[PDB]
Amino acid sequence: LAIADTYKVRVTFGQASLIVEELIKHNPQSYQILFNKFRSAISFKPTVATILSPDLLEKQLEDVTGNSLDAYDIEASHERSDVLRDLTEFHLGVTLYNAMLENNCS
Amino acid sequence: EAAAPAGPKEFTEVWNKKAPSTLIVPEFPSNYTAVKAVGEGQVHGDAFPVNFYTPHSILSQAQKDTVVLPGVDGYFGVKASHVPTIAQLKPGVVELHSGAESEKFFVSGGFAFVHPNGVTDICVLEAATLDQVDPAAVKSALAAASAAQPTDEFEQAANRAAIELYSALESAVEAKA
Amino acid sequence: APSGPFYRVAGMSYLRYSNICADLLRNVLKEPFKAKAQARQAIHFRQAPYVDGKAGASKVYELENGIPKTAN
Amino acid sequence: GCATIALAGVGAGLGVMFGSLINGAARNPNIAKQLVGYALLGFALTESIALFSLLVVFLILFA
Amino acid sequence: SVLAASKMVGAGCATIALAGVGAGLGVMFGSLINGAARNPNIAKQLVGYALLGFALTESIALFSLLVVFLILFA
Amino acid sequence: GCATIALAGVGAGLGVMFGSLINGAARNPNIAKQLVGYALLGFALTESIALFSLLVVFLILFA
Amino acid sequence: SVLAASKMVGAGCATIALAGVGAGLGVMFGSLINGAARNPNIAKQLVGYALLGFALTESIALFSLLVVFLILFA
Amino acid sequence: SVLAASKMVGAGCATIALAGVGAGLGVMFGSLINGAARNPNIAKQLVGYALLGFALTESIALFSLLVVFLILFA
Amino acid sequence: SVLAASKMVGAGCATIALAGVGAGLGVMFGSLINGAARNPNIAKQLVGYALLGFALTESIALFSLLVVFLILFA
Amino acid sequence: SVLAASKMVGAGCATIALAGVGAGLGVMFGSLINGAARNPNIAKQLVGYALLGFALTESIALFSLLVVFLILFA
Amino acid sequence: SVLAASKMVGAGCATIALAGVGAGLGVMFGSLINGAARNPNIAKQLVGYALLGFALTESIALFSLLVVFLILFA
Amino acid sequence: SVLAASKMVGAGCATIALAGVGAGLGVMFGSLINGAARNPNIAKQLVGYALLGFALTESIALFSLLVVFLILFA
Amino acid sequence: SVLAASKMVGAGCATIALAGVGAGLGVMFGSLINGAARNPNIAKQLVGYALLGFALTESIALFSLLVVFLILFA
């Protein structure tokens, strides 16, 4: 995939959602986001921000002698398996929106 | 069950064996936040940290003593040592109270997490305050949204989201204090 | 065919759903704050698949009012 | 007198049904006018049994 | 008549089974109100699940009214 | 005496119907009085059993 | 004193209806706690609905406590 | 004729077990209306799970309807 | 001596109004646990709703306990 | 012949216990439909949990019927 | 001697008020399990609310076995 | 033989305690279907928690069956 | 023999308190399954809270089991 012409007008979350929604067309177990963290005008350390697919691998990595996700009371309409389906696309679209905004200022 | 011992710390010494030695390790989003979930503390009594966020704004990051959140089951309120909660929110009014003063933001939907240390992390997309909403054109589009009923289930879902958004928005512009 | 909320069963993702509810909130803001919310509503980018390595088709987004309500 | 105790379950039935409409209208108030169309459809099909009970009271007493 | 007094006292107790038909159908007809409040799009296919459940629970309402019929008039 | 045991489930159902008026108002206080128009319509309609079971307790005693 | 004896065994069965309004108020005051634990800043409006709910659920309790005394003293 | 009277009072209060089966199938067929509102893409399989549960609760309903005839006619 | 005996068998059927009052008080105090498990900074205010609920739950328990006395000693 | 009368009137009081097992089996099989509407991936284990749960509560339905025949024919 | 014979029957049917009070402690101590499964940080504060409840729904049980000895020995 | 007759009408009333243990056990086995639908990774500890919850609530059933054979043959 | 008869119809009508007690133990041991199915880290503390509830709701069973021997043998 090749996304371009993204900083032409500005970077918005609805644009970064459509860029993210093209990455749920493929269904990986993880997402790797390589960008430059704008710390100051001098230093730009690169960043790897990782987003795991909801129960493909994400709840498997929270599972410790039980789970670290079972502390939370789910207050959704449907199950925990499809609120995390809603929540990691939202975790993908947030980190994507931050990546191409931290990079554009870097 | 956890055969992949991942993390930012473990990624460092593994990356020093496959990458060239000239590069420092990439940073991680854990290195830019000190507020964790299981880090015990972070309440001190009555007022708890409320990180009400937005993609384009940080609307509040100071502490409040009760937050009225519009969950999909209904409106609930968060006290200091609330139970850990991942709450999906409807379009509704997030009410921030720290005492006698009360700000009302109407949000579009988006989750709100209560972590085990007592920090509330409201995470919505569009969070307009009720001072800058109009009570006129909301029913001008809601009566329009109560008309276009197609058999297309994609637009049927977006018209359903069109209905319940303006229905809760009108219900929270009628009964203002 | 999907099993979940009303947006998810209808094929729609949560990202397009929650942006639709963000798009429709901005259409009913007050005009001293409605036009500045139109800045964060516009979608201007383009995409291209790469199936072989160098060749691919194209797709251009030039929207200024928000995420598309109809099916993608 | 021991026959009309069938109305105790009908009194417990309409309270659960009309309580489930207060909760139903508290979720989405737009469908709330179709809920009373479903409540009274459920109320009449519940009072069928409530008048099934008193009719045999009117057959124990008057037949 | 010890039997004619006994049939009214019997069939009076026999019709209180219609309390459970009145009580269970409140939970079933309250279920479609919260079944319609969660998704109005499928609010008529669930009526196709209510009347299939309503008539199969009035099997009990006619089985109890069969016993009221079989005390007094066997 | 046995005729007014039918008043058990009427009061036991009404505590669930008014148990939903609290939970319904605590789930959206903006619609909190349209629910009472749904409650008192449902209360008066579920009292019909409380009037049916009390017309029986006089039709036995005085008729 | 058979009618005086049937007034004693009748009035005990007449007050079984307080088990229903006793379990009704415990449900309604049980959701008063659960309603005031969802959002406690509305908890002054719920007791305005709970005490209206209490006094109107007793309606049946006082409907049933008149006919524990209508059969005894009349 | 004390036994001929006792079969009417005995089988009268025998069939009040159809209260719980009528109230049991009201909460079973009601949960399908909540079940077919969560995912209507399984809403045919849930009837395959209701009727397996409906036949097994009817089995309890004909256990009691066996005794209402085994008192009356045996 | 049926007038003396029917006061005492009428008393035992009178105090089964305490079945539901004890059953209502369990879901009221059970929801105080779940009420104080969501947000325990209201666990002082919700106990003030539990005892306000218990005092009006007993309102019909003490009404049941005077009726069992009015058929025993009045 | 009061012993031949009281075995019939006791057996109808003995089979009231088929209300509650008729009531629990609707709750359990109503939870089968709700439990299989949450995750259809486990829709065979829950029926294997249902009929391990059905046959272990019916045991009390047949224990009730073991008291019916032991007072009727013994 | 029907005076003490109704003391045998009346004190029998008096103590079935303990059905619902045993059901109240089943709901109340049932609600302590999931209330302590949600936040175990408060799980020692809730047993102080459960044993406040267990001792004070018993008050209905203490009002229930009061009248069972008030029949047999008064 | 009113001494021999009253045991059969007593043993029928004594086994209505098998109503509630059937109705609770349907709730307990229905709560496992909803329990195993949340996390099937720990679905076997729940069945280990069900049969412990079963064998302690059948303990009410056999304590009530202890009373029936203590009336009928003791 | 009516007084010696009344001990066994009395104690037969005394152990219906063990109906709702076991209906309580189904609700309490059902929420233990749901309490364990939420978080398994605390699944051994909740059984410590279940038998904290079990030995206190059985007290109502032994508050009934002593009375069912108080009618028969005192």
Automatic annotation (TrEMBL), chain A:
**Keyword terms of this UniProt record:** ATP synthesis, CF(1), Hydrogen ion transport, Ion transport, Membrane, Mitochondrion, Mitochondrion inner membrane, Signal, Transport
Q: Where in the cell is it found?
A: Mitochondrion inner membrane
A single Gene Ontology CC annotation of this entry is:
proton-transporting ATP synthase complex
| Single GO molecular function | proton-transporting ATP synthase activity, rotational mechanism
Q: Which domain of life is it from?
A: Eukaryota
Q: What is its main location?
A: mitochondrion
Q: Which family does it belong to?
A: Belongs to the ATPase gamma chain family.
Task: Please report the name of this protein according to its UniProt entry.
Answer: F-ATPase gamma subunit
What is the source species?
Polytomella sp. Pringsheim 198.80
Gene name on record? atp3
Q: Which part of the full protein is shown?
A: 160 to 265 of 317
UniProtKB/TrEMBL annotation, chain B:
Q: Which domain of life is it from?
A: Eukaryota
InterPro entries the record matches: ATP_synth_F1_dsu/esu (IPR001469), ATP_synth_F1_dsu/esu_N (IPR020546), ATPsynth_dsu/esu_N (IPR036771)
Q: Which residues form the ATP synthase F1 complex delta/epsilon subunit N-terminal domain?
A: 50-120
Q: In which compartments does the protein localize?
A: Mitochondrion inner membrane
**Stated family:** Belongs to the ATPase epsilon chain family.
CDD domains, per database record: F1-ATPase_delta (cd12152)
Task: Provide the species name.
Answer: Polytomella sp. Pringsheim 198.80
Q: Which HAMAP family match?
A: ATP_synth_epsil_bac
Output the Gene Ontology terms for molecular function.
proton-transporting ATP synthase activity, rotational mechanism
Q: Which GO CC annotations does the UniProt entry carry?
A: mitochondrial inner membrane; proton-transporting ATP synthase complex
One Pfam family matching this protein = ATP-synt_DE_N
Q: What is this protein called?
A: Mitochondrial ATP synthase subunit delta
Record keywords, A-Z: Hydrogen ion transport, Ion transport, Membrane, Mitochondrion, Mitochondrion inner membrane, Transit peptide, Transport
Automatic annotation (TrEMBL), chains D, F:
User: V-ATPase proteolipid subunit C-like domain: which residues?
Assistant: 1-60
From the Swiss-Prot or TrEMBL record, state where the protein is found: Membrane; Mitochondrion
* Annotated transmembrane regions: 1-23, 35-62
Query: According to its UniProt record, which protein family does this protein belong to?
Result: Belongs to the ATPase C chain family.
Name assigned to this protein: Mitochondrial ATP synthase subunit c
Give the lineage.
Eukaryota, Viridiplantae, Chlorophyta, core chlorophytes, Chlorophyceae
Shown residues in whole-protein numbering: 65 to 127 of 127
From TrEMBL, chains E, G, H, I, J, K, L, M:
Question: Where in this chain does the record put each V-ATPase proteolipid subunit C-like domain?
Answer: 9-71
Q: How does it sit in the membrane?
A: Multi-pass membrane protein
> Could you tell me the keywords of this UniProt record?
CF(0), Hydrogen ion transport, Ion transport, Lipid-binding, Membrane, Transmembrane, Transmembrane helix, Transport
Q: Looking at the record's lineage, which domain of life comes first?
A: Eukaryota
- Any one GO CC term of the record: mitochondrion
Q: Where in the cell is it found?
A: Membrane; Mitochondrion
GO terms in the biological process aspect are: proton motive force-driven ATP synthesis
Mark the transmembrane ranges: 8-34, 46-73
List the Gene Ontology MF annotations in alphabetical order. Answer: lipid binding; proton transmembrane transporter activity
Q: Name the protein family.
A: Belongs to the ATPase C chain family.
Which named protein is this? Mitochondrial ATP synthase subunit c
